Design a protein around this ligand. Structure first.
Ligand SMILES: C[C@]12C[C@@]34C=CC(=O)[C@@](C)(CCC(=O)Nc5c(O)ccc(C(=O)O)c5O)[C@@H]3[C@H](C[C@@H]1C4)O2
Ligand SMILES: C[C@]12C[C@@]34C=CC(=O)[C@@](C)(CCC(=O)Nc5c(O)ccc(C(=O)O)c5O)[C@@H]3[C@H](C[C@@H]1C4)O2
Lengths: 411, 411
């Protein structure tokens, strides 16, 4: 009966270009939200986002190859390299077959979609790049990485919008636990800070508009919430079978204990007031881990800072925790990080891991005035030390009412 | 130990708007390839594709809701309804939780991407539709369908480009076999016959250019091959646990016996001459099914009619079959159907099923002059009756060297 453990991490976030730097920033309650400058935001109702600062891949990706890939792919490859390195794993002809990847994204190569389309409109199909398809499609991070590292085991790419990160990690673990693979690099990558991404979610009325204070915009559960904030980044974890990792003396961050999925069956871009769907997703992860809601010390909420969304998740926590409801710590890193969409669940799974290694829980900043009727401990303003925390749970929910929860156990 | 069976089918193809009509057409060796008329193809090097003829959803989707979804979503929903109906399954409050979906697509809502982008370029972010995101993203078919049918179990969407259909079906079966679900609607949907899809794959030099004979264009293994042909469609199958299906007296088309995945780790848009990757994918499906290459009576090849691609797959068959190499029937439905990308593996999984029900195997049309050095029986020109065939295998390969194989067993 195969157990899965995390033996490698990598990340690119609006608050740091490494795992450690990003963790540091979050515990210090820093914000990565800034004003956009790569395109004219005049007509845009939202003019800020959590961007990746001074990105550099020169040492990892030839500017020759960079031409064949959208920022989202570029990000994910870098985070994947970080993870592969940090794992210390060495690919051998024996190995190849039993190592793979499960990496996706919510929207994929918007930027190159826009470029290629603009080109076509201005000068015809003659102007489309031969790399249009391969540079924009969601599965390309798994593509480039399996090639770069000679990985030959199972490779998949789940695109469940804002739920992607959690699904890729969850299925990567299943692939391993099932016997199909021994190691899996998994997570997600996103870079939707484009005219289309901003204008698009902007058109749905899903974005915050607090342009006077981009850092105060993302405020989960606070009463002045006005919609989620966009974030770019990538998060990746090397998942590996317990005995395979030991046999190689791998540093093991944590164990992946439970994975749960659910479907809202309600509305395409909104959850029930009731949070029924998030509840089942958490409820199935517990049952998969074989433990009780009482044992969860920390929950990394999906908490996107949308009026209807944050309320639903809260509702669902009460429902699952009941008694403990107030004794469990809950927080949204999105208060500082922004919403990474297809990468949200990857980075947050990383934070849910480090919170067990460091027995510390990052805050929900901007939580000035909670929502009324809230019994929950949303860890507002300042990180919080914890005692004997053995399990953390991570939530991701997405459009189409698709939900997922991962449960991590210490050591 | 949970077995998975197919208890429902649905389809939209360039040769038929139902399962039965499409099967009929294929066995008769008909072609669905035609010249494009929905956009000006003057500047286009490829001017044809396998389109879905006289699509109608009026009875299933309100023109009110149709506004919120790309053709690709519209197609997939219809095929999903067909499948749900054909399964005879009835969703009950008990049920909901244990029924879900695993549906994806290669490229998603290109058409609405183009519309929305054009709008933005012509009149600003003000012109983007509030439905931009929800109408174009890959996971929306699973979204709309879980809602329409009150499905609350696990919902996922794998986007592994041209390998998608096989992956969604394969993982849907795993979800079931693992205990996460009892029923899963699974497959894929595509509609890339757009300026971007045509110009895009056209820019990669991956499309056939035989505009003088659109019906002769798709010719897997033939010596005058000139690249794949684009096809629109959707294919869906209801997968369900054996005892759950029996307990309800479900008509059972076949059993899903093996699922295999592999990664080429070679090139982003091309397979090794050696076909090493396809071999492992087939090789793992056999091992998963617990049977031998000898027992496979029919193989539905990925056979896309690209020079480098068809050769690689052939190579891989020899490698896996060896002795039997000539005693196993191999064929490409893409000779008539075109390439459905993210939906290819769904429809072809359907054909791999019916070939067991009807003990008949559809031909590879246009196979005038094989490639030299080929020992394989590619079932050229005319469908072929078969005797005691108990297993069929279905191949899907995609960009990023991602591969997958499904193995179906009679009854
Ligand atoms: C039609 C409306 C109704 C509206 C009303 C109140 C709201 O609060 C929002 C802004 C968002 C509802 C929501 O929270 N959706 C939601 C979700 O279901 C799953 C994931 C996420 C995520 O970001 O990962 C998410 O954002 C909705 C959205 C946009 C528009 C305005 O739908
Ligand atoms: C850079 C080049 C080299 C080139 C040369 C010879 C060829 O024959 C083609 C046209 C296609 C190779 C190929 O077969 N790729 C391939 C694949 O790996 C997996 C799936 C599929 C599918 O359609 O599901 C597929 O199409 C390639 C493509 C385009 C361009 C011309 O890469």
């Amino acid at each position: 009966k195969r157990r899965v453990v995390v033996t490698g991490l990598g990340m690119l976030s609006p608050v740091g270009n490494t795992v450690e730097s990003t963790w540091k920033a979050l515990l210090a309650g820093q914000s990565g939200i800034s004003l956009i400058d790569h395109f004219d935001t005049s007509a845009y109702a939202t003019k800020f986002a959590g961007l990746v600062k001074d990105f550099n891949c020169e040492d990892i990706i030839s500017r020759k190859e960079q031409r064949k890939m959208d920022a989202f792919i570029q990000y994910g490859i870098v985070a994947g390299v970080q993870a592969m390195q940090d794992s210390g794993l060495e690919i051998t002809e024996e190995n190849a077959t039993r190592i793979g990847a499960a990496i996706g994204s919510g929207i994929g190569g918007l930027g190159l979609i826009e470029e290629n389309h603009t080109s076509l409109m201005n000068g015809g199909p003659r102007k489309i790049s031969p790399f249009f398809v391969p540079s924009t499609i969601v599965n390309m991070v798994a593509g480039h990485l399996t090639i770069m590292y000679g990985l030959r085991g199972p490779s998949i790419s789940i695109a469940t919008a804002q739920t992607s990160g959690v699904h890729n990690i969850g299925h990567a673990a299943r692939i391993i636990a099932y016997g199909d693979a021994d190691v899996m690099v998994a997570g997600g990558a996103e870079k939707a800070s484009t005219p289309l991404g901003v204008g698009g979610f902007g058109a749905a009325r899903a974005l915050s508009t607090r342009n006077d204070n981009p850092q105060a915009a993302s405020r989960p559960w606070d009463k002045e919430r006005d919609g989620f904030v966009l974030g770019d980044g990538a998060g990746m974890l090397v998942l590996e079978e317990y005995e395979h990792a030991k046999k190689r003396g791998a540093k093991i961050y944590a164990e992946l204990v439970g994975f749960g999925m659910s479907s809202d069956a309600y509305h395409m871009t909104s959850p029930p007031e009731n949070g029924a769907g998030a509840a089942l997703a958490m409820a199935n992860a517990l049952r998969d881990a074989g433990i009780e809601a009482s044992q969860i010390g920390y929950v990394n909420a999906h908490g996107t800072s949308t009026p209807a969304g944050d309320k639903a998740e809260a509702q669902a926590v009460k429902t699952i925790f009941g008694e403990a409801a107030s004794r469990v710590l809950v927080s949204s890193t999105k208060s500082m990080t922004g919403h990474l969409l297809g990468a949200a669940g990857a980075v947050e799974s990383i934070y849910s891991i480090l919170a067990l290694r460091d027995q510390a829980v990052p805050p929900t900043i901007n939580l000035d005035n909670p929502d009324e009727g809230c019994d929950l401990d949303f860890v507002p303003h300042e990180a919080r030390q914890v005692s004997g925390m053995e399990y953390t749970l991570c939530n991701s929910f997405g459009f189409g009412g698709t939900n997922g929860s991962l449960i991590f156990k210490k050591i």
